[PDB]
Symmetry: none
Subunit: 24 residues, 12 copies
């Protein structure tokens, strides 16, 4: 069992996450 | 069993996620 | 069993996800 | 058993997903 | 058993998905 | 059992996360 | 100008929507 | 100008929405 | 100009939304 | 200009939202 | 200009939101 | 200009939000 995980990133990443604004 | 996972990214990524704004 | 997964990205990606705005 | 998965992307991708706006 | 999957993309893709706006 | 995990980052990353603004 | 919209639902509704699984 | 919107729901609703699983 | 919006819900609602699982 | 918004909820609501699991 | 917003909730609400698990 | 906002909650609310687990 030989397992290899490779992740390479070379680009700018912009992330906006909004969770909420719910009225109950 | 030989397993290889390769992920390469070279492009700018913009992500906007909005979860919410529900009225109950 | 030889398994290889390769993912290469070179293009700009723009993603907008909106989940919500439901009135109950 | 030899398995190979290759995915290559070179084009700009724009995705808009809206789930919601349901009145109950 | 030799299996090969190849996907190559070179064109701009624009996708708009709207699920919702149902009145109950 | 041979396991290798490699993560390499070379791009600027900007992340904004907002959780809240719920009225009860 | 008098306008009235009335929607009444009394039956169980099951909806499954799958958008995707496209290879480019 | 008199406008009235009324929505009444009395039935169980089950909704499954899957957007994605696209290979580029 | 008289405007009235009324929404009443009395039934159990189950919603599952999955957006993603795209390979680029 | 008279405006009234009324939302009443009496049923249990279960919501699961998953955004992600994308490989770039 | 008379504006009234009323929101009343009487049912148990369970919400699970997962944003992430993306490999770059 | 008369404005009134009223929010009333009487039901137990359980919320789980996970943002993260991204590999770069």
């Amino acid at each position: 069992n030989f397992l290899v995980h490779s992740s390479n990133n070379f680009g700018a990443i912009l992330s906006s996450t909004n969770v909420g604004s719910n009225t109950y």
